[PDB]
Amino acid sequence: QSALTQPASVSGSPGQSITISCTGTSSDVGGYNYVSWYRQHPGEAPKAIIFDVTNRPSGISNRFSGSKFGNTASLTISGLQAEDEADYYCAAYTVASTLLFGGGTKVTVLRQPKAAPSVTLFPPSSEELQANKATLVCLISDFYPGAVTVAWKADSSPVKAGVETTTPSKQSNNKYAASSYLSLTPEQWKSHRSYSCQVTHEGSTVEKTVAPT
Amino acid sequence: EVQLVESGGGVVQPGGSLRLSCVASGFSFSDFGMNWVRQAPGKGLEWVAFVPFDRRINYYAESVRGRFTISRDDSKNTVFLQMDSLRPEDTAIYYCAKHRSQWNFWPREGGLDHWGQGTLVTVSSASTKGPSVFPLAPSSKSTSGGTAALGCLVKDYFPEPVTVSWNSGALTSGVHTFPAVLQSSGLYSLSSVVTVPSSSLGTQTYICNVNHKPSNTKVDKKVEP
Numbered sequence: 001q002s003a004l005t006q007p008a009s010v011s012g013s014p015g016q017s018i019t020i021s022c023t024g025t026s027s028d029v030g031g032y033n034y035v036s037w038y039r040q041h042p043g044e045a046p047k048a049i050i051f052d053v054t055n056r057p058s059g060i061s062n063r064f065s066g067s068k069f070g071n072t073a074s075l076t077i078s079g080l081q082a083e084d085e086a087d088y089y090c091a092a093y094t095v096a097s098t099l100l101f102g103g104g105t106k107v108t109v110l111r112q113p114k115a116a117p118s119v120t121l122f123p124p125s126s127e128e129l130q131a132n133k134a135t136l137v138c139l140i141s142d143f144y145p146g147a148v149t150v151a152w153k154a155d156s157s158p159v160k161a162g163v164e165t166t167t168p169s170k171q172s173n174n175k176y177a178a179s180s181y182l183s184l185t186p187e188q189w190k191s192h193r194s195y196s197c198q199v200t201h202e203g204s205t206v207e208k209t210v211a212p213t
Numbered sequence: 214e215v216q217l218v219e220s221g222g223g224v225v226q227p228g229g230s231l232r233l234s235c236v237a238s239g240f241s242f243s244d245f246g247m248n249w250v251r252q253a254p255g256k257g258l259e260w261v262a263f264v265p266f267d268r269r270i271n272y273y274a275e276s277v278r279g280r281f282t283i284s285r286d287d288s289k290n291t292v293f294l295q296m297d298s299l300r301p302e303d304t305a306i307y308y309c310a311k312h313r314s315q316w317n318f319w320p321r322e323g324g325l326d327h328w329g330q331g332t333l334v335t336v337s338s339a340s341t342k343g344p345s346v347f348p349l350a351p352s353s354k355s356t357s358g359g360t361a362a363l364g365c366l367v368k369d370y371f372p373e374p375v376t377v378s379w380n381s382g383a384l385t386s387g388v389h390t391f392p393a394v395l396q397s398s399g400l401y402s403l404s405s406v407v408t409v410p411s412s413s414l415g416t417q418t419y420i421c422n423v424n425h426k427p428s429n430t431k432v433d434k435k436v437e438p
Contacts (some may be wrong), residue, residue, distance in 0.1 A: 051323050099263065135368070
């Protein structure tokens with residue numbers, strides 16, 4: 001029941017062509033030609049843009065085209081225009097007679113230089129520890145395009161429990177901000193040597209680390 | 214044109230039940246299979262359920278099977294989604310969506326050609342609550358280029374929003390109040406930071422003024438090294 005695999009972020013300058021991949025398995029994308037694509041603008045409902053791999057509904061610009069080979073379907077958007085900036089989802093019929101959506105891709109139409117995130121990581125406060133709680137605060141700002149993935153480490157090992165991460169929010173400078181929070185018990189905090197917040201943006205990771213006092 | 218109108222959304226306690234409706238118009242309803250697809254706040258689309266043309270087998274995502282039931286009333290051009298044993302993770306906008314191809318028994322040919330605007334289902338026991346505010350002290354870890362970042366962590370409030378000022382609004386430059394995270398409990402948390410000259414830390418007082426109008430709670434907290 002895992003989503004079909006799409007890239008988090010695909011971007012291009014106005015006028016360029018971009019392609020979004022959608023990788024399933026022989027149980028779905030590679031099993032049938034019933035692959036569809038949907039465009040969703042923020043605050044709005046999804047709209048069908050491609051169906052049965054290659055077909056465009058009427059009203060849909062012919063700058064959009066769909067294809068598929070093996071377990072991967074692709075949406076191509078040529079002559080990128082401002083209005084194309086949106087989230088895009090693929091979906092495929094499956095061998096279980098269900099319809100399964102991909103994880104979605106944010107398409108950015110680049111209108112300023114790409115900018116890696118600024119990451120600031122705060123340890124639990126002595127006040128919070130006395131309340132018998134502990135929160136690590138990873139603040140991520142001024143990044144563009146507006147998509148990041150966040151991972152946390154206790155010492156050198158990943159931790160997934162107790163993580164909550166916001167979706168990126170557009171700032172007044174048209175870059176993006178996000179936050180991630182790791183909840184621990186005070187004893188967890190104090191036992192380990194350090195914790196780390198790792199933020200990946202456009203394939204590159206910036207890391208920050210804090211330690212108990 | 215095709216119109217799909219969802220209703221029935223609202224706030225429900227975990228373990229509770231809710232029935233959604235989708236009223237369709239602008240096409241021959243009884244000829245098409247219908248779907249529910251949901252979307253958690255800021256997350257992706259998740260297909261939920263399909264009801265075929267003409268009373269065959271209903272199909273469901275594993276995530277909801279055994280708790281949700283889809284059905285239709287062709288005389289009323291209505292699709293229903295009965296939701297039982299609701300969980301916080303069921304919180305989402307629920308969309309009604311028509312299948313493109315006529316008379317299909319599965320959510321197969323043609324994909325989902327038309328969608329409603331959705332109805333919000335919130336599964337939560339949260340109730341009005343002011344935040345707990347904790348300082349985020351400046352230190353060497355949050356200091357670069359002779360500029361120190363300090364902040365306030367505004368935990369566990371409901372509903373949105375909180376506002377944060379610094380020094381009663383006199384400090385505005387370098388202020389950043391981040392968007393809130395929604396916790397599994399149904400409560401929110403956010404942080405506000407301000408960047409200041411690291412040389413002023415011993416001489417200047419920095420206070421975050423947290424205002425949570427929905428609970429009528431105000432907190433002023435000094436933040437220092």
